[PDB]
Every structure is written in C-alpha cells, then in structure tokens.
C-alpha cells in the first residue's frame, strides 16, 4: 500500500540506511531476518503494560548504599509537590510507594487521576516501588538536593500506539578462480597469494594457501583447494575466510559456509573484500564491501545439501579446579583442553568453567559437537546459578560461534533488571558484531528489552545508529535490528526520534561548514564567529524543531538556542559549544542545556570508556564507595563526529594554571587550592570542595590506571567549582596517572610528606582499587571487547594483557595494595616532569 511505503521512508530516514536495498547481498539473510523479527517484536508489543511503558519509571532493587542512608538521619524524606504556582512539603518514609504518598497529600489538602512527575523532566515517580528505589530520588540524595515534583495527568497510553504491520563424507573444497582490482596499490609489485581458512570462533579449523603469483591488476589460479575437513564435519557458523597476502595482510572477506536455512553454501561467488588499514571484530563480518568500483574482489566456486559420570581421582580435580579458577586471558594448553573435555561432566558443575570448557571443544568434528549439545541439554546447574554478568559476556565474545553456547548466555541476561541492562547495553549492542548470523538470540534480547522500556529503547536507538553510520562492516545487520525496534517503539517515540535526528542533522551541517573557515592557526577570528551567529539565527527561524530530546539525557527536552552563549571553540578541530533553553516551563532552575558538537575524533572510543566508568561506579556502589566520577554524556552520531554534554561551572586544570602566569609550560603548586577557595562562598563549602576533590581524584586515578589511560596532559583534566575532578577527551617518560603537585597541595601536602587528606586519598584509592579487583573477570572482558569492537588492529595478547597486569591478577590483597601505593609514589617522584614534557614536546 501507499502508506506502508511512506512509513518505510520514515524508517529509512531515522535509520540512515535502506534495509530494502539489495545491491550488496548474495543471499536473502537480511530479508529473512526482517520477517523473523516480526514475531518477537509483536510478542513484546502486545504484552507490554501501556501505563508503565508511557511513564517508564526508572527504578532499581538494589539497596540504598550506606553512604546515601547516612543522608537520612530520621527515616523521613522531604518531597515537594506543585500545581499552578502553589507547593506544599510532604514528609515521607523511604519505604513509601508513590501511591501511598498521594493519599498522604490528597488527605493533607482535602477533607480524578494524577501522577507525580519530576520538575523539569520527562520522568515519573509511579509504580509499586519504595520511593528510595527510584533513580531520580537516589540522584537527589547523592547531590544534596531537594526532590522537586509536579502533579498532573498520566500521559495518554494511546500516544504510544503502534502501527499495525502488513507483513556426505567428501572433503570440503573451494575453487579460487582469481582476484581482480582496477588499480594496484603503490610500492612496486610484491608477490600475492590467497589463504583460505575454515574458521569457527576465531579458531582456524583448517587452512590452505594457493601458489604465489605476480601481483597484477588481474591474477588467476583455477585451482581446487582441498581441505583436511570433511563436509559433514562443518559446524554451523563456520566461515570460509578468504585472505590475500603480499610481501603482508592486505585484503579479507568471509563467507558463511552454512546459511540461515541450514543449507551448505553452493555455487559461484564474486566477493568484494575489505582492505586492511596501515585481532578485531571487523575481520569477522559476513558483509562484503559495497564499494564495487575501487575495491578488490575474489571469485570462487563451491559445488559440494542438509543436516540439523564415574568419580574422579584427586590431584586431577586440583588440576581441573586450578584451570577453572584461572582468568579469561589465560591460554588453555592442549593438555588443559583435553582435561576439561574428558572431565566435561565434572566441569559442568562449575558455571565458571563454561568458557574454558566450550573453548575445549573440537568444533570441526560433528560427533563431538553433538556430545557438546547433549552436555548442554542437561544444563540445570547453569540454569540455577546466580547471574554473573562477566561469565556471560565471555560466552558472547569472539571465541564462541556456536548458537547453542551463545544462547545460554542470552538466557542468563533475561534476569537483568532494566537498571542493569542500561549499564551493559552498549557492549551488548557491540557484541552483536560477534554473532555469525544476523538473527540471533542476542539480537532478539536487545529488541525485546528495548521495546519493554523507553529508556532502554532510546539508547538502543542511538547506539545502533552510531554503528550504522560509521561501520561499513556491520551497518546492514545493525539496520535490520534498528528497523525492528522502530517498528514497535510507538508513534510518540518515532515522533520524538524523528526530531532528534533533524536537529543533529542540521547542527553537524553547521559544525562542518565552520571547520573550513579557520584552518589550524589557533586564533578564533571575528569573521568566523560572525558566521556562526548568522547560521544559528537562521535555523531558529523555520527549520529547528521547537523542542528536541537530549540524546545523551532523554529526560531533558531542549528548546531554543541561546545564540548569545554559543561559540566556535578554541581548539584545532572546531567544535561548537552550544547552549539551549529548556523547553519545560516547570524547571526549577533557569540554567541552560549545553552541548558540544565536534568533528575530528572517533567518539565511539569515548562512549566505550565512559560506559566502563559507569560500570565501575556501580561496582563501587556494591561496596558502599562513592568516588564522584563524572561520566558525562557523549554519543557518536557519524564518522568522526558527535555530541558531548557540557558540564557546568567547570574549567580545565591547564586553564587554572595559565591564568596566574600563562607561560611556556611553567606550573604552580598552590594555584588549584587558591582557585577553590575563590569559588567557595564559605570555608564550609570549601571543605566540601576539598572533600569531593579527594574522592574524585581517587576515582579517576584508579579507574584510569586500570584502563591504561592515566597519562594525560593537563588540558584534558577538568575540575568543577565545587571540587569534582574529571578526565575528558579519551578519543585514543611516563606516569601511571595524573597526581601532580597542584593536586597534592590541595591535599595539604608537598613533595614527599603526609597529611589527613592525603592519608584519606591513599586509603580510598586502595579500597576502590581492590573493589574493582573483586570483579576482575568482568572488567577484563569489557576491556577486551572494547579493544576489539572499538579501535583499529589490536593484539590478542599484548594490548589486552595490559589490564591483567594493571589489575595485578593472582595477587593477595596486600601485594595489590602495595603495587598501587607504589604507583601513587611514581607520580610524586616525577611531579611536573611529564606535564612539562608536553610543552617541550610541542617543539619535539
């Protein structure tokens, strides 16, 4: 119909890719996955509660941490309800429901359907949760702030309405006909061959190279390549991995040997390949290069149909248990593998053995695969174990291509509350890049969770859209999933989304136009500032949505530019610092929503780092630590371009240093402390400032050491007026982290002595450090996946191994404590050295 075609034009615009275009396909897996996702979409659409979906309470079952209780010395919580311009203050108990609080207000005012919504924000205190278990309430306690709330009507569930949809035993062999590219690289002519790997879980089941031959624009072989593997032994999800070396890896492509209908892949292929840049998730994709013109191809012919205990000794269990207790980057020896396999049944009793156990399977042998499947049919120990998110992520990584091993991981994710999904969501989305097939249990989990909760849905959208606009390697898969999400999120979220896209479409247009106008020369010129104001005026008239939702903070609705406060910014890239009126008349404050828009950097790395930071704060929350990190908002929108939350009342440490003298890399030990007292109206708030600085300094020193990003120049560390240190700009002699003598002086100490605030700082660092170490396995897997889904060509030992050593694996708590305090001292020894070394470097 002529409306299903319009609705699909809507979808294409939101997605930024056309899921009906079939110019870069060679089978129908993408189409098949669209039909396939209709069922789980519709199952979740129909069973979701209209009321709770529209209002999307943001809630948790975790206990209020000890540090937040201590901010309620009375078992009462002060909440403030509003109308017209009236307001009263109801004393309330933490265990009280929102329901119970209304009837202790309606009675307090009178002796009809209303809900308490947060002032300034699309966010609600509704549902059968104690008010202490709402996230907005926990945020207002953390921040020393009054819980402000209006009284008004539930939003019409009807607005969320969804549009009805109108939906043998021979060896395997491949023929390498030849390769063809129109323009030959650059250097001279070096020789070229084709390497054909049979690959499963990044494990090479078997390998065969063609003969070497001259590297011309056109090279032909006409060779069958016989593999050691039989056809009946190919596991589901095995890739034919075709690669080309000269010298030396220059090109790769992949073909799924078995397809989405379980059929062996037959016949002629001309595959357009990806070029290497100058191990990671890009190397794994079943997508072909869509640039059919510049790119290198390979031609092949497949012509090959179906298919679908007794008790241990003692020191061996010790061996088995030692292997099991060992960390996720510990290489399994052939000895070790056979041990796990032979004693698979005993191994199955330990949910932690699972990664190593399933990575001890010979996936290239059908009878053994089958035994593995019989192993898992009896997974009752697995099904009763508490969710261990780290274990689960290991099974969803690049080392497992079996649908059945991967599905028991997904099954375990099911008991994650929405709160926890939010924390892992970006890496679960990235883990879709390790699925052999487009339709997986992991894709369907994300779809369902997205659809069940607007907050999850929102972020799912932007996280998928981030990959769809930048990764040639996975945009088709991510687009099919995004469409499926969009086809059920509701007409009110589609509207909201459509506006958000329109805004960052316009603003990035402006961002790029301004980069051209002042090249590199560091001055911000008056002429180029003068165009920025013109261009923004223009969009505010007859182009820019009256109001859009802040992608990194979907509660907030931004309204109109404050053109006056906007400015092209003083860096080499030319980011737009932008400020917006809030569109909500009931906002308590009058402050602006600030957003930095910038091209030049890969913001996906920034996203990855920030999200680990959040995870890290949650870990510290499980042990009643609060490190006052400031994991600011940040979303990649396109190629080397995206948005960043502006943090209020913040300045760089560099700036604070350059105000006093503003010199050629000179530095002052005392200026940070003087800046703090200046910004604090009372000595009272100043001690609240030195406090936050001690915690926040400690948070970032630990976090940042663990992730290996601690050696930063001053320009990229900031502080709020009220004491919060935070690192910025993670987009890609030495120091383990930045504890400089100006930081040290705030702590009431000077090069090599002690103080109350520095004793505090040390011991907090130790508490926080060894708290991360309790989740060593989870952090190692996030880091690893981060490196594989987030950066260029990284090392499956070397780069990954950094975090093992940094988390000082396999050490008792006293060695660790020691190691980390030794790092606190390397920073003291060195002082200004590295910081000064940068200005030495700009001439170097």
Ligand X SMILES: CC(C)n1nc(-c2cccc(O)c2)c2c(N)ncnc21
The total number of residues shown for the chain amounts to 844
Binding mask 135-154 for ligand X (x = CB under 6 A): --------------------
Q: Closest separation between CB of residue 632 and ligand X, Å?
A: 5
One of 728, 735, 780, 824 touching ligand X (CB under 6 A): 728
Integer Rg of the chain from CA: 29
One of 42, 376, 650, 688 touching ligand X (CB under 6 A): 650
Q: Does 729 bind ligand X (CB under 6 A)?
A: yes
Q: How many residues bind ligand X (CB under 6 A)?
A: 12
Q: What torsion do the CA atoms of 722, 739, 784, 16 make, to the nearest 10 degrees?
A: 40
Question: What are the residues facing 576 on neighbouring strands?
Answer: 568, 597
CB 252, CB 268: distance < 8 Å: no
Q: Closest separation between CB of residue 645 and ligand X, Å?
A: 6
Among residues 498 and 658, whose Cβ is nearest to ligand X?
Answer: 658
Q: Closest separation between CB of residue 673 and ligand X, Å?
A: 21
Among residues 606 and 742, whose Cβ is nearest to ligand X?
Answer: 606
Q: What share of the chain is helix, strand, coil (3-state, %, to 5)?
A: 45, 15, 40
Stretch that binds ligand X, among 258-266, 415-423, 623-631, 645-653 (CB under 6 A): 645-653
Stretch that binds ligand X, among 142-150, 471-479, 640-648, 808-816 (CB under 6 A): 640-648
Q: Does 800 bind ligand X (CB under 6 A)?
A: no
Q: Closest separation between CB of residue 429 and ligand X, Å?
A: 22
Q: Does 30 bind ligand X (CB under 6 A)?
A: no
Determine which helix (DSSP H) or strand (DSSP E) holds 474, and give its type and residue range.
Answer: none
Q: Closest separation between CB of residue 652 and ligand X, Å?
A: 5
Stretch that binds ligand X, among 61-69, 225-233, 646-654, 672-680 (CB under 6 A): 646-654
Secondary structure of 749-761 in HEC code, one letter for each residue: CCCCCCCHHHHHH
Supply φ then ψ for residue 745, to 5 degrees: -75, -35
CB 410, CB 393: distance < 8 Å: no
Among residues 623 and 729, whose Cβ is nearest to ligand X?
Answer: 729
Mark residue 139 as left, alpha or beta (left: phi above 0; alpha: psi -120 to 50; beta: remaining). alpha
Q: Closest separation between CB of residue 712 and ligand X, Å?
A: 12
Helix and strand counts by DSSP (H, E) for the chain:
32, 24
Binding residue numbers for ATP? 594-603, 629-637, 726-732
Q: Does 647 bind ligand X (CB under 6 A)?
A: yes
Q: Does 646 bind ligand X (CB under 6 A)?
A: yes
Q: Does 8 bind ligand X (CB under 6 A)?
A: no
Closest CA to 81 of 162, 147, 10: 147
Q: Which two tokens stand for residue 689?
A: 């400032």
Distance CA 510, CA 525 (A): 17
Residue nearest to ligand X (CB): 728
| CA atoms lying within 13 Å on the CB side of residue 56 | 21
Question: What are the residues facing 203 on neighbouring strands?
Answer: 200
One of 181, 566, 644, 747 touching ligand X (CB under 6 A): 644
Stretch that binds ligand X, among 142-150, 533-541, 643-651, 676-684 (CB under 6 A): 643-651
Other CB atoms within 10 Å distance of the CB of residue 808: 18
One of 424, 632, 693, 743 touching ligand X (CB under 6 A): 632
What is residue 259's three-state secondary structure?
Answer: coil
Stretch that binds ligand X, among 170-178, 647-655, 742-750, 761-769 (CB under 6 A): 647-655
Q: Closest separation between CB of residue 819 and ligand X, Å?
A: 30
Q: Closest separation between CB of residue 39 and ligand X, Å?
A: 42
Task: List the Cα angle 775/781/787 in 5-degree steps.
Answer: 135
**What residues between 564 and 623 interact with ligand X by CB under 6 A?**
575, 596, 598
Binding residue numbers? 594-603, 629-637, 726-732
Q: Which two tokens stand for residue 746?
A: 């705030």
Q: Does 190 bind ligand X (CB under 6 A)?
A: no
Among residues 231 and 654, whose Cβ is nearest to ligand X?
Answer: 654
Distance CA 91, CA 682 (A): 29
Q: Closest separation between CB of residue 691 and ligand X, Å?
A: 22
Instruction: Name 322's Cβ contacts closer than 8 Å, sequence gap at least 6.
Output: none
Q: Closest separation between CB of residue 588 and ligand X, Å?
A: 21
Determine which helix (DSSP H) or strand (DSSP E) holds 96, and give its type and residue range.
Answer: none
Instruction: Name 250's Cβ contacts closer than 8 Å, sequence gap at least 6.
Output: 185, 244, 275, 276
Q: Which residues bind ligand X (CB under 6 A)?
A: 575, 596, 598, 632, 644-647, 650, 652, 728-729
């Amino acid at each position: 119909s002529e409306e299903s075609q319009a609705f699909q034009r809507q979808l294409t615009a939101l997605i930024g890719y056309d899921v009906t275009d079939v110019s870069n396909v060679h089978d129908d897996e993408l189409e098949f996955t669209r039909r396939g996702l209709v069922t789980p979409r519709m199952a979740e659409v129909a069973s979701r509660d209209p009321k709770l979906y529209a209002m999307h309470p943001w809630v948790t079952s975790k206990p209020l941490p000890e540090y937040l209780w201590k901010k309620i010395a009375n078992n009462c919580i002060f909440i403030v309800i509003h109308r017209s311009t009236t307001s009263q203050t109801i004393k309330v108990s933490p265990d009280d429901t929102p329901g119970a609080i209304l009837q202790s207000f309606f009675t307090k005012m009178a002796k009809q359907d209303f809900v308490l919504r947060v002032c300034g924000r699309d966010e609600y205190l509704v549902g059968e949760t104690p008010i202490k278990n709402f996230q907005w309430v926990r945020h207002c306690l953390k921040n020393g702030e009054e819980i402000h709330v209006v009284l008004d009507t539930p939003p019409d569930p009807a607005l969320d309405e969804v549009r009805k949809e109108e939906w043998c035993d021979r060896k395997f062999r491949v023929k390498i006909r030849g390769i063809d590219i129109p323009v030959l690289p650059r250097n001279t002519d070096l020789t070229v061959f084709v390497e054909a790997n049979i690959q499963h879980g990044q494990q090479v089941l078997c390998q065969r190279r063609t003969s070497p031959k001259p590297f011309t624009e056109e090279v032909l072989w006409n060779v069958w390549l016989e593999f050691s593997i039989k056809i009946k032994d190919l596991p589901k999800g095995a890739l034919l991995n075709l690669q080309i070396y000269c010298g030396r890896l220059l090109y790769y492509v992949n073909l799924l040997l078995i397809d989405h209908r379980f059929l062996l892949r037959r016949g002629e292929y001309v595959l357009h390949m990806w070029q290497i840049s100058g191990f990671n998730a890009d190397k794994l994709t079943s997508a072909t290069n869509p640039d059919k013109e510049n790119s290198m191809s390979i031609s092949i012919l497949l012509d090959n149909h179906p298919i679908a205990r007794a008790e241990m000794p003692n020191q061996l269990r010790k061996q088995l248990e030692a292997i099991i207790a060992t960390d996720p980057l510990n290489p399994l020896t052939a000895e070790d593998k056979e041990l796990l396999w032979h004693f698979r049944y005993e191994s199955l009793k330990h949910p932690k053995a699972y990664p190593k156990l399933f990575s001890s399977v010979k996936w290239g042998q059908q009878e053994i695969v089958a035994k593995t499947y019989q192993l898992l049919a009896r997974r009752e120990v697995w099904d009763q174990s508490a969710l261990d998110v780290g274990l689960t992520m290991q099974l969803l990584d690049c080392n497992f291509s079996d649908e059945n091993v991967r599905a028991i991981a997904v099954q375990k994710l099911e008991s994650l509350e929405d709160d926890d999904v939010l924390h892992y969501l970006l890496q679960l989305v990235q883990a879709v890049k390790f699925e052999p097939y487009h339709d997986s249990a992991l894709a369907r989990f994300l779809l369902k969770r997205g659809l069940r909760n607007k907050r999850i849905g929102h972020f799912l959208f932007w996280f998928l859209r981030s990959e769809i606009a930048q990764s040639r390697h996975y945009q088709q898969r991510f687009a099919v999933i995004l469409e499926a999400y969009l086809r059920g999120c509701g007409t009110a979220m589609l509207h909201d989304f459509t506006q958000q896209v329109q805004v960052i479409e316009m603003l990035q247009k402006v961002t790029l136009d301004i980069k051209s106008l002042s090249a590199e020369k560091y001055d911000v010129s008056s002429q180029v500032i003068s165009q920025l104001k013109q261009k923004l005026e223009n969009l505010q008239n007859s182009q820019l949505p009256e109001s859009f939702r802040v992608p990194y903070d979907p509660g907030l609705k931004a309204g109109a530019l404050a053109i006056e406060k906007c400015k092209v910014m003083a860096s080499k890239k030319k980011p737009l610092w932008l400020e917006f009126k809030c569109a909500d008349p009931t906002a308590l404050s009058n402050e602006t929503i600030g957003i930095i828009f910038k091209h030049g950097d890969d913001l996906r790395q920034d996203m990855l780092i920030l999200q680990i930071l959040r995870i890290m704060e949650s870990i510290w929350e499980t042990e009643s630590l609060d490190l006052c990190l400031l994991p600011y908002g940040c979303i990649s929108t396109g190629d080397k371009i995206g948005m960043i939350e502006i943090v209020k009342d913040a300045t760089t440490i560099a700036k604070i240093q350059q105000s006093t003298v503003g010199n050629t890399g000179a530095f002052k030990d005392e200026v940070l402390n003087h800046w703090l007292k200046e910004k604090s109206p009372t000595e009272e708030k100043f001690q609240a400032a030195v406090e936050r600085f001690v915690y926040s300094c400690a948070g970032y020193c630990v976090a940042t050491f663990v992730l290996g990003i601690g050696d930063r120049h001053n320009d990229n560390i900031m502080i709020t007026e009220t004491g919060n240190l935070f690192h910025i700009d993670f987009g890609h002699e030495r120091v383990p982290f930045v504890l400089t003598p100006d930081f040290l002086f705030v702590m009431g100490t000077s090069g090599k002595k002690t103080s109350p605030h520095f004793q505090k700082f040390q011991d907090i660092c130790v508490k926080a450090y060894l708290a991360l170490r309790h989740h060593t396995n989870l952090l190692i897997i996030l880091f690893s996946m981060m490196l594989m889904t987030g950066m260029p060509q990284l090392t499956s030992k070397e780069d990954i191994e950094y975090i093992r050593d940094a988390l000082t694996v396999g050490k008792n708590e006293e060695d660790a404590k020691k190691y980390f305090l030794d790092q606190i001292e390397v920073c003291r020894d060195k002082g200004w050295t590295v910081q000064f070394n940068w200005f030495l470097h700009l001439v170097l």
